[PDB]
Design a protein around this ligand. Structure first.
Ligand SMILES: Nc1ncnc2c1ncn2[C@@H]1O[C@H](CSCC[C@H](N)C(=O)O)[C@@H](O)[C@H]1O
Ligand SMILES: Nc1ncnc2c1ncn2[C@@H]1O[C@H](CSCC[C@H](N)C(=O)O)[C@@H](O)[C@H]1O
Ligand SMILES: Nc1nccc2ccccc12
Ligand SMILES: Nc1nccc2ccccc12
Lengths: 257, 268
């Protein structure tokens, strides 16, 4: 809550999206694994629609690279102004923006349609219509008079809920809150840390609720989802680096029903 | 007739060849735009990748003939040969490769071409690994003159004879006429082992191009002239494809009408 007030976006990016965790060359790393889950999922042609919302985007865009070719209206979100500012720096190709081009290139590699990475970034930048504040603790996380088209055909969320929740029930309630944004029959792609209890973002020291795969699954069910897919990536030693205590990463593909 | 004079004009004219200007003219946009799949860059990379993907072109050693200051022509090749020789007539080109080999920032940036080859080869290789492997496999950069019967000189370093040759936009760009072109092909063919493969890329119906102050003379050749010379030199032609240069890529840096790609195997 107040902890997120010290949250340094550049320190978070550095910690998680620069070497070693950001080395995309080795297929056995977490970056490649995440992009694979995303790419494979959309390549099924079963997650489709006009509008999409990314929950708790932070200062990162990688989580939409494969998504952006299946949704013409994309909304990004975060609780922090500084994170929203950092996104704009990349959306507007402004000065000092974070360099996502390695991830773009890899999404292009993985998707295998021979797309160049610049075309990919262009499409993402074009389809992102708005960056909005959000609080998942609020039963109406986007507030009242939201410019975002509701309900969304699909949701994506990476490393948010467990990271903003003191315990299971809060995680459960947060999942309930975002779920109200999703149209019935719609899809949620959810990615997150497994059995993590803290991580660092510069001066900020954030508390995390350690969750298991089974816990994640049960929560989705409780929230009204059929779980179509749930995979775990176990975190190799070399990617365990003092910035946190994550044990694995989960990917869930859930369908509101 | 007499070979010496034409060859002499050629040598003379290349003394003004400016590598950076050439790089800019041909490998920066619009020609360097790899995003449009209908462009010449992606066509060239595709010819090479697809050819190497047959698994049919392999061995220990490969020689690139008239590399100039470019490396794109070896990106797909380099997973198939442990020993690669690069070559050029001009020291300033060889220096240019020097800069890239040393991975200096001053170097021309080939990373879009590296990524694009990774993209179409379809193995999910990252571009940094592709580049690191090319840099490792290039064992030497040698002077070369294709008008000499021994284009590498006598008692050359190169492992001869090579298992394969690559050559891009060299032969036609340094030959005053068809008979000169044919002889240059004969000369480099002495470096290839029998049963070896030659991958040849070049300009079709071009008579000139610019490389700075350098406005250089090229023999215009047709696809059929290229086919006959390969046969004349003892190759079976396995593949010969033509790219027609789109109007928007016809930028006044040359009068090229198209580009040819040939896969030929030396008889024996
Ligand atoms: N109460 C709240 N409601 C919604 N998002 C919140 C929140 N409190 C903090 N956040 C955001 O949750 C994010 C967790 S980390 C950023 C994750 C990013 N999507 C990526 O995958 O790396 C931070 O950006 C943080 O600012
Ligand atoms: N007599 C000769 N024998 C062999 N190469 C020569 C030569 N005279 C000039 N060259 C080289 O022929 C090249 C033509 S430009 C082609 C460069 C590169 N292979 C690419 O694909 O773009 C220049 O590098 C030029 O210096
Ligand atoms: N453990 C963890 N927390 C937040 C973001 C991450 C991104 C990539 C790997 C691990 C992460
Ligand atoms: N080197 C060269 N000469 C004429 C036409 C070209 C077209 C595309 C790449 C290189 C070319």
């Amino acid at each position: 809550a107040s902890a997120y007030q010290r949250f340094e976006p550049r320190a978070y990016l550095r910690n998680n999206y620069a070497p070693p965790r950001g080395d995309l060359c080795n297929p056995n790393g977490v970056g490649p694994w995440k992009l694979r889950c995303l790419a494979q999922t959309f390549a099924t042609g079963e997650v489709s629609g006009r509008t999409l919302i990314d929950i708790g985007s932070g200062p990162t865009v990688y989580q939409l690279l494969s998504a952006c070719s299946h949704f013409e209206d994309i909304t990004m979100t975060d609780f922090l102004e500084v994170n929203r500012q950092e996104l704009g720096r990349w959306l507007q190709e402004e000065p000092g923006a974070f360099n996502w081009s390695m991830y773009s290139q890899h999404a292009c590699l993985i998707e295998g349609k021979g797309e160049c990475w610049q075309d990919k970034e262009r499409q993402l930048r074009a389809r992102v219509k708005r960056v909005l504040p959000i609080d998942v603790h609020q039963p109406q996380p986007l507030g009242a008079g939201s410019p975002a088209p509701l309900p969304a055909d699909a949701l994506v969320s990476a490393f948010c809920l467990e990271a903003v929740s003191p315990d299971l029930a809060s995680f459960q309630r947060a999942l309930d809150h975002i779920t109200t944004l999703l149209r019935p029959g719609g899809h949620l792609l959810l990615i997150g840390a497994l059995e993590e209890s803290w991580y660092l973002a510069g001066e900020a020291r954030l508390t995390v609720v350690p969750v298991s795969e089974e816990e994640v699954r049960e929560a989705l069910v409780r929230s009204g989802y059929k779980v179509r897919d749930l995979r775990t990536y176990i975190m190799p030693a070399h990617l365990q680096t003092g910035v946190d205590d994550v044990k694995g990463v989960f990917f869930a593909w859930a369908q509101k029903v």
